[PDB]
Amino acid sequence: TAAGISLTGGRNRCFSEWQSFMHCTAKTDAKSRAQCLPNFEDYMECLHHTKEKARLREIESVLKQKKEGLEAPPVKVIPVKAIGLV
Amino acid sequence: MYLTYYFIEITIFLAILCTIFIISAKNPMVSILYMIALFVIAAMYLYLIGLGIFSLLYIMIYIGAIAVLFLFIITLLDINSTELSVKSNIRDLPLVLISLIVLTISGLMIYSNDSILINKLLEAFGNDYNTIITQDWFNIENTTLLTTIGNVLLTNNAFILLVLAIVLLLGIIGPISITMKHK
Amino acid sequence: MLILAIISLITFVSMSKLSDNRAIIRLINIYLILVLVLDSFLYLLFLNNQTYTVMGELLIFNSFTFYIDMLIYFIMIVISSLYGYNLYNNNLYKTLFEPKKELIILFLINILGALLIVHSNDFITLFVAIELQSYSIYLITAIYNSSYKASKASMLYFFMGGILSILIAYSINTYYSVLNSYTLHSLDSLIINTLDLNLILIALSLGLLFKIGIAPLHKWLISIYENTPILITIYISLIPKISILSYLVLSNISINSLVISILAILTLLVGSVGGLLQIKIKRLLAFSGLTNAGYMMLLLLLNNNEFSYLYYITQYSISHLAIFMIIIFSIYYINYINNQYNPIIYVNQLKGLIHDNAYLVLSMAIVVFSFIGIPPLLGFFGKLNILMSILNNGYYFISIVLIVASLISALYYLYLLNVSIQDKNNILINSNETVSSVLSYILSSLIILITFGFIYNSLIIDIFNVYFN
Amino acid sequence: QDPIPSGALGQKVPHVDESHQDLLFRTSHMVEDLETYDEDSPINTSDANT
Amino acid sequence: MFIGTIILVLSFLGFVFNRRNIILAFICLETMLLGINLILLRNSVLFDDISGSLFAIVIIILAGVESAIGLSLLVSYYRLRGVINSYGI
Amino acid sequence: MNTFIIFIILIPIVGFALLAVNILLAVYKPYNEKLGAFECGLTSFNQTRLAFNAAFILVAILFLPFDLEISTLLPYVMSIYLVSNYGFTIVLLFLLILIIGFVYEINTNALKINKHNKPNTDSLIYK
Amino acid sequence: EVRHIELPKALYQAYTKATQAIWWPTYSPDQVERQFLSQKIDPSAKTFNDLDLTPMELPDLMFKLIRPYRVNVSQLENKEKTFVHIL
Ligand SMILES: CCCCC/C=C/C/C=C/CCCCCCCC(=O)O[C@H](COC(=O)CCCCCCCCCCCCCCC)COP(=O)([O-])OCC[N+](C)(C)C
């Protein structure tokens, strides 16, 4: 079937994490799949980005509380007709 | 520039609006015309998400065959209909409201996997983070989406195309066999 | 080899006349017989529960499914002999039991759709095959279109099958939204621990089950089974039950299901007490299907249920098929034939049946004590081997409710006997025309399997020990 | 020709004669069971598409 | 997922509380099928695969043949009774 | 802003403008004998419902399963190089499964309407 | 159900003033003032009674003049089960 076939026929976005989990389940009998948990956790959060959104709201809640705000090399936004302006 | 931001939400609202004119319209074929409008709103959303191929497959297949079939039925057949009187559906209204709340929330529930029920729902609404699109130069040919569908319908799932041929055959044989009156 | 039958057949039926239709079915009957006889030996592939996956993670072939396949062919050989053979050579029975031109077409397309579920690994194979068999039940219901009841039943069945097809499709895509996967083979017993796949797999199970006749949504199926004629309804009762249930018994997605356990309790209750004060024989006979589909929903809660299931399947299929074939034979002895499509309805119409063809009452008795679970008959070991699986695995309130449901359901089973062994004033003394030899041999064969089929219980289990373990 | 027909709980059930398909029996109110007046019988059809 | 779920739920309730005619019940069924499509197509786009698009292009055809079959069932229902009731079948 | 979407916005404004110049510039002036549908200078009663032939409805019911094949052949025609020698045979088999249902349709003469203009087949047997 | 608005007089008057600048005949702004003035009949005059005529009432003749704008169960369904509808 089309297990890991992407839109262009390539491999999908979370193929490497899925194939790593399938390496984990290939060499492993039941009653010892408890070690195969971190590969599955990596796959599910590759799919849905749950821990990533959690971490980003943890750091966004701090970002609004500072009056200084941003003391860093900043990210500049551009309009689409100005990719290579300067 | 940011006028082009809320388009998806607009279509959602617009799609909502269209369904209320489907279920409540005095003439039937006027409501089937509102359904044709709902297919157009769907194809707007499918272009808007990035699937420009499907939008024209919807306008070809759903609008141009299924709706033409429906309008063609309503023309030369007899269908009584009653108007949306307040007296006949005001008895339905409380089970309508209860089912709106429950079916809507519980449809929003299974996209999420916390054991706590309230944490399931709030993960439905935490989407405001903007995905970063990176350019990867790994692909050398213009395999579009329709090319990949034609590779997977034809090699990996060829049997599904072939059982699908049996289904299209059945869709020929059936309507004929009902409406023959052989001899 | 159903494919070759359909492709050859519909080209052949396009060229035959109307009067040829009957004989066409005779041909197909013998065709299916030589698919059982000359092609059985494929059971040798399935030693020691060796399973195959064919067409690339698409169809799964084990020997459980091979048995379901063989069972579906056997019952079709029966049903096809019912359409393709005359009962009597009267001017009456030619206009009562007459096949349409395209009837066997929809029959074989339906069996194709019912086999592509039990053999199925993928979910889109599941969805396409449910859609194929659902269309076929739509059109088999509506093919006798010069009947008010059958057309109303086909419309009712269309809308109530459309809802429970979109519920299955919503459950498949809900499962896809949390796992980039189509198989329940991906689940492999670690994922169910750390993933809330309860509500998905249970909603998938429900949307598959409400098409059987499970009990919150059971009234519409009893209406379709009463409205359809007497030959269409022994097919559309049997086939979606054994196909959809042997899908859901093969893939064990509702174990410790509290919802399946409630609906099993509710099914055994309102099936046994539903069909008590009823006077139509197809009604009475269709709430027997509700309770006996209740005994399956128990086995869905089980792990490792492939003995109790298959034995009680071929039990119910032979008993089912026989009790519908008996009331085909009682039509010669009734004093009142209405309703050309459905000639016997009311259960008091078979009242003097012991004084006219008493061994039809011997037949009727033997099959109806097997529905109750009387131990010299084959229905009892089916209920017994369900009980051995229920009590093994912790379902103790389910077991006593099973028993109370069996006791209540014995009442309207024995009502058939009560009505049949009674006095009638005007008895038959002699008949000119007699019943079809090849067609009454089928009922005699279906009894001798029910009577003397407890013989082979030992042999079967030893064969069951080799090919599934 | 029984005195009282039985109904699996000892109830009284109607014996279905030809005399149950009239105009007053048509479109009565009842559950779909225990009901006479079928819609398909050769006295109710009476040249149904002529 | 909001547009597909809202189309599915509103179309489902419009199907259930239909008492006015029958062609509203057919078109509520078809708008349901559109909603299931929308949910799946979005999940294909977000997961980077044609896989759900494969199930989508198959269920397009199955929705089509469902329309063809069931509307011939309606013509069979209408053949013996020259009018369709407002309350339903 | 491409020049693709000026067009799809711009055709309607032209059509709305021509409809508007008709509504603004022509007189309106109706009455009852002007209103009413046209049939050849004679009014009549319209019958509430009329009968039709099964082939009329069968053309457009039957239309859709052939249309769904023609859009099923559309994924193949774009991937015809990739599935060399193999998807060819699968598409052959698909088209052949369709063609035998089509020859069912043409053998039944489903879309043909007969004529009841029979020339009195039965001869003159007398007495 | 014919529409009903009944908005205030001054806004209505300014609206009629706005619509006076258009070529086709529009509702007059002094026809607003005649919405207040009612039928004041002179008793020192001669009616239909003099010339021997009886005028026809509006309710008897409403139906004829309003005919073109007019828009338009079980025994039928017991009688329509004998006709032919598919041929
Ligand atoms: C020359 C070939 C003749 C064609 C035979 C076609 C048969 C079609 C009939 C299907 C349903 C009828 C029941 C068949 C039982 C097979 C048991 C079996 O053996 O089942 C086992 C396990 O069963 C089960 O789970 C439970 C099923 C229990 C059946 C209960 C009914 C018992 C009474 C009837 C059986 C005894 C009658 C013999 C009369 C002399 C696995 O099945 P298997 O893979 O070993 O298939 C065997 C291949 N055989 C057919 C070619 C030999």
CSV table of N, CA and C in Angstrom, one decimal, chain E:
chain,number,residue,atom,x,y,z
E,1,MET,N,-10.1,21.5,10.4
E,1,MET,CA,-11.0,20.4,10.7
E,1,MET,C,-12.4,21.0,11.0
E,2,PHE,N,-12.4,22.3,11.2
E,2,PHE,CA,-13.6,23.0,11.6
E,2,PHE,C,-14.6,23.0,10.4
E,3,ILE,N,-14.2,23.2,9.2
E,3,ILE,CA,-15.1,23.3,8.1
E,3,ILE,C,-15.7,21.9,7.8
E,4,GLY,N,-14.9,20.9,7.8
E,4,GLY,CA,-15.5,19.5,7.5
E,4,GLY,C,-16.4,19.0,8.7
E,5,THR,N,-16.0,19.3,9.9
E,5,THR,CA,-16.8,18.8,11.0
E,5,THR,C,-18.1,19.6,11.1
E,6,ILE,N,-18.1,20.9,10.8
E,6,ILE,CA,-19.3,21.7,10.9
E,6,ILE,C,-20.2,21.4,9.7
E,7,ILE,N,-19.7,21.1,8.5
E,7,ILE,CA,-20.5,20.7,7.4
E,7,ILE,C,-21.1,19.3,7.7
E,8,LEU,N,-20.3,18.4,8.3
E,8,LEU,CA,-20.8,17.1,8.6
E,8,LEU,C,-21.9,17.1,9.7
E,9,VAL,N,-21.7,17.9,10.8
E,9,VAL,CA,-22.7,18.0,11.9
E,9,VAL,C,-24.0,18.7,11.5
E,10,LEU,N,-23.8,19.8,10.8
E,10,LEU,CA,-25.0,20.6,10.4
E,10,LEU,C,-25.8,19.8,9.3
E,11,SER,N,-25.1,19.1,8.4
E,11,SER,CA,-25.7,18.3,7.4
E,11,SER,C,-26.4,17.1,8.0
E,12,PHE,N,-25.8,16.6,9.0
E,12,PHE,CA,-26.4,15.4,9.7
E,12,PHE,C,-27.7,15.8,10.5
E,13,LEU,N,-27.7,16.9,11.2
E,13,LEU,CA,-28.9,17.4,11.9
E,13,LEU,C,-29.9,17.8,10.9
E,14,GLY,N,-29.6,18.4,9.8
E,14,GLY,CA,-30.5,18.7,8.7
E,14,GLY,C,-31.1,17.5,8.1
E,15,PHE,N,-30.4,16.4,8.0
E,15,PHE,CA,-30.9,15.1,7.6
E,15,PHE,C,-31.9,14.6,8.6
E,16,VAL,N,-31.5,14.6,9.9
E,16,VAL,CA,-32.3,13.9,10.9
E,16,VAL,C,-33.6,14.6,11.1
E,17,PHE,N,-33.6,16.0,11.2
E,17,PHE,CA,-34.8,16.7,11.4
E,17,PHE,C,-35.5,17.1,10.1
E,18,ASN,N,-35.2,16.4,9.0
E,18,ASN,CA,-36.0,16.6,7.8
E,18,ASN,C,-37.4,15.9,8.0
E,19,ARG,N,-38.4,16.7,7.9
E,19,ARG,CA,-39.7,16.2,7.7
E,19,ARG,C,-40.5,16.8,6.5
E,20,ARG,N,-39.8,17.7,5.8
E,20,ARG,CA,-40.5,18.4,4.8
E,20,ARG,C,-40.5,17.7,3.4
E,21,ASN,N,-39.4,17.2,2.9
E,21,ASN,CA,-39.5,16.3,1.7
E,21,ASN,C,-38.4,15.3,1.8
E,22,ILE,N,-38.1,14.6,0.7
E,22,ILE,CA,-37.1,13.6,0.6
E,22,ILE,C,-35.8,14.0,-0.1
E,23,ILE,N,-35.9,15.0,-1.1
E,23,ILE,CA,-34.7,15.4,-1.8
E,23,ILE,C,-33.8,16.2,-0.9
E,24,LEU,N,-34.3,16.8,0.1
E,24,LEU,CA,-33.5,17.4,1.2
E,24,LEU,C,-32.7,16.3,1.9
E,25,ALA,N,-33.3,15.1,2.0
E,25,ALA,CA,-32.5,14.0,2.7
E,25,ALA,C,-31.4,13.5,1.8
E,26,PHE,N,-31.6,13.4,0.5
E,26,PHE,CA,-30.5,13.0,-0.4
E,26,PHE,C,-29.4,14.1,-0.4
E,27,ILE,N,-29.8,15.4,-0.4
E,27,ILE,CA,-28.7,16.4,-0.5
E,27,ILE,C,-28.0,16.6,0.8
E,28,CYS,N,-28.7,16.3,1.9
E,28,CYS,CA,-28.0,16.3,3.2
E,28,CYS,C,-27.0,15.1,3.3
E,29,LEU,N,-27.3,14.0,2.7
E,29,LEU,CA,-26.3,12.9,2.6
E,29,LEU,C,-25.1,13.3,1.8
E,30,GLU,N,-25.3,14.0,0.7
E,30,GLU,CA,-24.2,14.3,-0.2
E,30,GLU,C,-23.3,15.4,0.5
E,31,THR,N,-23.9,16.4,1.2
E,31,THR,CA,-23.1,17.3,1.9
E,31,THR,C,-22.4,16.7,3.1
E,32,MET,N,-22.9,15.7,3.7
E,32,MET,CA,-22.1,14.9,4.7
E,32,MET,C,-20.8,14.4,4.0
E,33,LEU,N,-21.0,13.7,2.9
E,33,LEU,CA,-19.8,13.1,2.2
E,33,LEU,C,-18.8,14.1,1.8
E,34,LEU,N,-19.2,15.3,1.4
E,34,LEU,CA,-18.3,16.5,1.2
E,34,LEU,C,-17.5,16.8,2.5
E,35,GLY,N,-18.2,16.8,3.6
E,35,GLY,CA,-17.5,17.1,4.9
E,35,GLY,C,-16.5,16.1,5.3
E,36,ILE,N,-16.8,14.8,5.1
E,36,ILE,CA,-15.8,13.8,5.4
E,36,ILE,C,-14.6,13.9,4.5
E,37,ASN,N,-14.8,14.3,3.2
E,37,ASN,CA,-13.8,14.6,2.2
E,37,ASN,C,-12.9,15.7,2.7
E,38,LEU,N,-13.4,16.8,3.1
E,38,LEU,CA,-12.7,18.0,3.6
E,38,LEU,C,-11.8,17.7,4.7
E,39,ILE,N,-12.3,17.0,5.8
E,39,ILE,CA,-11.4,16.5,6.9
E,39,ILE,C,-10.3,15.7,6.4
E,40,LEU,N,-10.5,14.8,5.5
E,40,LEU,CA,-9.5,13.9,5.1
E,40,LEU,C,-8.4,14.6,4.2
E,41,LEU,N,-8.9,15.5,3.3
E,41,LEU,CA,-7.9,16.2,2.4
E,41,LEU,C,-7.0,17.1,3.2
E,42,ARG,N,-7.5,17.7,4.3
E,42,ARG,CA,-6.7,18.5,5.1
E,42,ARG,C,-5.7,17.6,5.8
E,43,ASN,N,-6.1,16.5,6.3
E,43,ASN,CA,-5.2,15.6,7.0
E,43,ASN,C,-4.1,15.1,6.1
E,44,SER,N,-4.4,14.9,4.8
E,44,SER,CA,-3.4,14.5,3.8
E,44,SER,C,-2.4,15.7,3.6
E,45,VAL,N,-2.9,16.9,3.5
E,45,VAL,CA,-2.0,18.0,3.3
E,45,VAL,C,-1.1,18.3,4.5
E,46,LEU,N,-1.6,18.1,5.7
E,46,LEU,CA,-0.8,18.3,6.9
E,46,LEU,C,0.2,17.2,7.2
E,47,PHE,N,-0.1,16.0,6.7
E,47,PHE,CA,0.8,14.8,7.0
E,47,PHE,C,1.8,14.6,5.8
E,48,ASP,N,1.8,15.3,4.8
E,48,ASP,CA,2.6,15.2,3.6
E,48,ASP,C,2.4,13.8,2.9
E,49,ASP,N,1.2,13.4,2.7
E,49,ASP,CA,1.0,12.2,1.9
E,49,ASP,C,-0.2,12.2,1.0
E,50,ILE,N,-0.1,11.5,-0.1
E,50,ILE,CA,-1.3,11.2,-1.0
E,50,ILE,C,-2.2,10.1,-0.4
E,51,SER,N,-1.9,9.6,0.7
E,51,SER,CA,-2.5,8.4,1.2
E,51,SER,C,-4.0,8.6,1.5
E,52,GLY,N,-4.3,9.7,2.3
E,52,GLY,CA,-5.6,10.1,2.4
E,52,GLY,C,-6.3,10.6,1.2
E,53,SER,N,-5.4,11.2,0.3
E,53,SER,CA,-5.9,11.6,-1.0
E,53,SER,C,-6.3,10.4,-1.9
E,54,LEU,N,-5.7,9.2,-1.7
E,54,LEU,CA,-6.1,8.0,-2.3
E,54,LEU,C,-7.5,7.5,-1.8
E,55,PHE,N,-7.7,7.5,-0.5
E,55,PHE,CA,-9.0,7.2,0.0
E,55,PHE,C,-10.0,8.3,-0.4
E,56,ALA,N,-9.6,9.5,-0.6
E,56,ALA,CA,-10.5,10.6,-1.1
E,56,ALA,C,-11.0,10.4,-2.5
E,57,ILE,N,-10.0,10.1,-3.4
E,57,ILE,CA,-10.4,9.9,-4.8
E,57,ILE,C,-11.2,8.6,-5.0
E,58,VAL,N,-11.1,7.6,-4.1
E,58,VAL,CA,-12.0,6.5,-4.2
E,58,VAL,C,-13.4,6.8,-3.6
E,59,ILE,N,-13.5,7.6,-2.5
E,59,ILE,CA,-14.8,7.9,-2.0
E,59,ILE,C,-15.5,8.9,-2.8
E,60,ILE,N,-14.8,9.7,-3.7
E,60,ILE,CA,-15.5,10.5,-4.7
E,60,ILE,C,-16.4,9.6,-5.6
E,61,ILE,N,-15.8,8.6,-6.1
E,61,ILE,CA,-16.5,7.7,-7.0
E,61,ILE,C,-17.6,6.9,-6.3
E,62,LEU,N,-17.3,6.5,-5.1
E,62,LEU,CA,-18.3,5.8,-4.4
E,62,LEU,C,-19.5,6.6,-4.0
E,63,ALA,N,-19.3,7.9,-3.7
E,63,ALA,CA,-20.4,8.9,-3.5
E,63,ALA,C,-21.2,9.0,-4.8
E,64,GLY,N,-20.5,9.1,-6.0
E,64,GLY,CA,-21.2,9.1,-7.3
E,64,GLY,C,-22.1,7.9,-7.5
E,65,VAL,N,-21.5,6.7,-7.4
E,65,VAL,CA,-22.4,5.5,-7.6
E,65,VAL,C,-23.5,5.4,-6.6
E,66,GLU,N,-23.3,5.9,-5.4
E,66,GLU,CA,-24.3,5.9,-4.4
E,66,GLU,C,-25.5,6.8,-4.9
E,67,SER,N,-25.2,8.0,-5.4
E,67,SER,CA,-26.2,8.8,-6.0
E,67,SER,C,-26.9,8.2,-7.2
E,68,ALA,N,-26.2,7.5,-8.1
E,68,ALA,CA,-26.8,6.9,-9.2
E,68,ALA,C,-27.8,5.7,-8.8
E,69,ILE,N,-27.3,4.9,-8.0
E,69,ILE,CA,-28.1,3.7,-7.4
E,69,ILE,C,-29.3,4.3,-6.7
E,70,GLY,N,-29.1,5.1,-5.7
E,70,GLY,CA,-30.2,5.6,-4.9
E,70,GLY,C,-31.3,6.4,-5.6
E,71,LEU,N,-30.9,7.2,-6.6
E,71,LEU,CA,-31.9,7.9,-7.4
E,71,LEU,C,-32.6,7.0,-8.3
E,72,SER,N,-32.0,6.0,-8.8
E,72,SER,CA,-32.8,4.9,-9.5
E,72,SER,C,-33.8,4.2,-8.5
E,73,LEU,N,-33.4,4.0,-7.3
E,73,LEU,CA,-34.3,3.5,-6.3
E,73,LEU,C,-35.5,4.4,-6.0
E,74,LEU,N,-35.3,5.7,-6.1
E,74,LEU,CA,-36.4,6.7,-6.0
E,74,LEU,C,-37.3,6.6,-7.1
E,75,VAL,N,-36.8,6.4,-8.4
E,75,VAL,CA,-37.7,6.3,-9.5
E,75,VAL,C,-38.5,5.0,-9.5
E,76,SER,N,-37.9,4.0,-8.9
E,76,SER,CA,-38.7,2.7,-8.6
E,76,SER,C,-39.7,3.0,-7.6
E,77,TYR,N,-39.4,3.8,-6.6
E,77,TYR,CA,-40.4,4.1,-5.5
E,77,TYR,C,-41.6,4.9,-6.1
E,78,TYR,N,-41.3,5.8,-7.1
E,78,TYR,CA,-42.2,6.7,-7.6
E,78,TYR,C,-43.1,6.0,-8.7
E,79,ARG,N,-42.6,4.9,-9.3
E,79,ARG,CA,-43.3,4.3,-10.4
E,79,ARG,C,-44.7,3.8,-10.1
E,80,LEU,N,-44.9,3.2,-8.9
E,80,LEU,CA,-46.2,2.7,-8.5
E,80,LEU,C,-47.0,3.7,-7.8
E,81,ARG,N,-46.5,4.8,-7.3
E,81,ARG,CA,-47.2,5.9,-6.6
E,81,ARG,C,-46.8,7.2,-7.2
E,82,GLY,N,-47.7,7.8,-7.9
E,82,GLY,CA,-47.4,8.9,-8.8
E,82,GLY,C,-47.1,10.3,-8.1
E,83,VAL,N,-46.8,10.2,-6.8
E,83,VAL,CA,-46.5,11.4,-6.0
E,83,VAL,C,-45.6,10.9,-4.8
E,84,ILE,N,-44.7,11.7,-4.4
E,84,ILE,CA,-43.9,11.4,-3.2
E,84,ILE,C,-44.4,12.3,-2.1
E,85,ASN,N,-44.6,11.6,-0.9
E,85,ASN,CA,-45.2,12.3,0.2
E,85,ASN,C,-44.3,13.4,0.8
E,86,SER,N,-44.8,14.3,1.5
E,86,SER,CA,-44.0,15.3,2.1
E,86,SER,C,-43.4,14.8,3.4
E,87,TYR,N,-44.2,14.0,4.2
E,87,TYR,CA,-43.7,13.6,5.5
E,87,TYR,C,-42.6,12.5,5.3
E,88,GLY,N,-42.6,11.8,4.2
E,88,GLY,CA,-41.5,10.9,4.0
E,88,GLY,C,-42.1,9.6,3.3
E,89,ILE,N,-41.2,8.6,3.2
E,89,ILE,CA,-41.6,7.4,2.6
E,89,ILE,C,-42.5,6.6,3.5
